[PDB]
Symmetry: C3
Subunit: 271 residues, 3 copies
């Protein structure tokens, strides 16, 4: 399926099954297919599961402009509006934790029943003057430099620390292939703009606007989005939030811990 | 090209050349590109070739519901109507043999000039109380369990018996890459439901409804869809059917025996 | 984005940034993504960049008919008219040099600020009775025969002489993957017809109609499109043309010499 955003960007999404809806927001630089197992798991147990390809990724159009969190939150708002969702559980992985938080910050939670932040960059990823523990911007600057030389090989090399293959996790070549194949669909410009946006965007104000039940899940072996400065703080700052830490889990834990994730998502929806 | 099925599913197809139409139905888990050489061969020799991506595969939408043979047969009907095709030769590979046969069973053959069943699951694939010689459902249950753990690696390992490479067939890396690339485009859900549909659907009644010239072609080294309980029996159950057995051919014989198959399809069309 | 060509073919394109327009025409058997680094480089320095997937390639429709340079040139005119472009700098790579020149030859240069020919097939690639120094038709006849047996493997093997990996150039496995993945998107029919087209189309008359500033760039290690009989001649035949030769560069120099091409394209646009 598709809808057209305000600026004319056509955004691809899947909408599977029926019941109360769970809307999924993928991480970088993947697309709605990273959720396919969570979606099959939940839609075949009575939920409606929806997942889109963020502008610039997967099967969506690749606009030059709007590759920023306010546009991404507003893209989400249009999707929810288009389908008239109500009592939606918002589920965001990695950079996709930020646009689901920023949807709530910019639009309220009238349509929202719950929030799940998975290995998410919230509340802040890169350094700020009062957040020196964040990741230095120079790290992201180098990533952008390498992306602008060879993004194919950069993503292919990203597989190991993403999935923690360098730390003993076991992930098939098949999954590594599909990861790279999906990433290559994406726009170079969107791929690079998203690094800027997630390096620099401060979601600490969004944390205070979150007034729904919230489950934060993070692997403490996460090489890409460090638990101590993201998920751990997001749980503390969101009033009432629950935290689950998957021990030694990597960033790609929707793959390596798929069953555990599925069950935790089901438990959360049934609380 | 696209057409929209009754439930809203957009379905991609290619429509090449001009002349009497030949409409191709692909097997699992592929899409219309598995036919590209037969299409080029026939459309250079004065036939119109049409091939669609089944719903849930390739460039088509991925609906949660309708991944079943009657819906597949009805998709094919809407394609035939959408184009107003007449004297169509229906060609189905593998699971694709069932939906061209179910099309005729549900809609009759008024539009149909002839039927080709290639490495096809007809008349029946899995076991039934009166057909213990079919493949036990257990076997399919395990394929499903594995696909629901890692479909990428499952399809990757599927290349070997599909093509008979595990038994010595020689098939390039490029073929194997393109095979997985196409597979990964499909829906997890459609990919899993098709196994259920092809394991359990009985096309014996459909065989009695086929009243057009029919050529059944099957490799007798087919490790995926065994010759003895499928093509062999389809050729006997269909009044007037002709049988060709490609000696030592694997399941993926549209690749390993492409030239032979092109010539047979051309000779059938010219009879 | 997409527009619809005269014959109904839908053609995908990207249109990034704003400013004076630069319109890119990819080579064989690639798509608009081959320009993503030039596009990002120029669009973030004040230029509008536009690049399309040729009919039969990438995300565009795969028509059986029209795979010829006059049609390719008219597709480009319809894009230019669709976007109402003025003072456009046309940039063509490899076979893509041919449809931008043919566009000038058929439509005039009223809309055109400039022409850049990169590793281009212009002014003529294959032999003619007055050009035995061209590549013999037999060579393209054999390529076609191989493409019509296994285009997946043929493009895979094409990576090496394309990038000059066999003559010590260094190109990552990620770029070779991406190149193959993009290639597999294309039609078998378009992939083969384009060989016919670039083998046999004479663009010498087009050279005499080019009355805009022109930069010709070629690598003199090009193993695919021989510098001596294409780019070197094109620069001589086009009045006022400037020539740059990238020493030992391969055909795939938009990758191996990306930064240098970027700077040269920027310098040309600022001339």
């Amino acid at each position: 399926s598709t809808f057209v955003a305000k600026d004319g960007t056509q955004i691809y999404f899947k909408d599977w099954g029926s019941g109360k809806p769970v809307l999924f927001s993928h991480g970088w630089p993947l697309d709605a297919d990273m959720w396919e197992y969570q979606m099959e798991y939940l839609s075949s147990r009575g939920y409606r599961t929806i997942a889109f390809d963020r502008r610039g990724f997967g099967r969506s159009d690749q606009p030059w402009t709007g590759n920023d969190y306010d546009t991404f939150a507003d893209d989400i708002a249009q999707l929810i509006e288009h389908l008239d969702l109500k009592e939606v559980t918002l589920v965001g992985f990695s950079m996709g934790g930020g646009d689901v938080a920023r949807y709530i910050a910019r639009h309220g939670s009238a349509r929202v029943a719950g929030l799940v932040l998975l290995g998410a960059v919230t509340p802040l990823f890169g350094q700020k003057p009062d957040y020196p523990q964040g990741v230095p911007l120079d790290v992201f600057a180098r990533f952008k430099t390498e992306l602008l030389k060879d993004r194919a090989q950069f993503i292919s090399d990203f597989n190991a620390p993403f999935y923690g293959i360098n730390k003993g996790q076991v992930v098939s070549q098949g999954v590594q292939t599909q990861t790279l194949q999906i990433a290559l669909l994406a726009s170079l410009k969107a791929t690079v703009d998203c690094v800027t946006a997630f390096a620099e965007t401060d979601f600490r104000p969004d944390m205070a606007k979150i007034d729904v039940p919230t489950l934060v899940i993070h692997g403490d072996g996460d090489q890409i989005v460090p638990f101590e400065t993201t998920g751990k703080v997001a749980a503390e700052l969101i009033k009432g939030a629950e935290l689950k830490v998957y021990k030694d889990a990597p960033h790609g834990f929707a793959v390596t811990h798929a069953q555990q994730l599925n069950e935790d998502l089901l438990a959360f929806l049934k609380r």
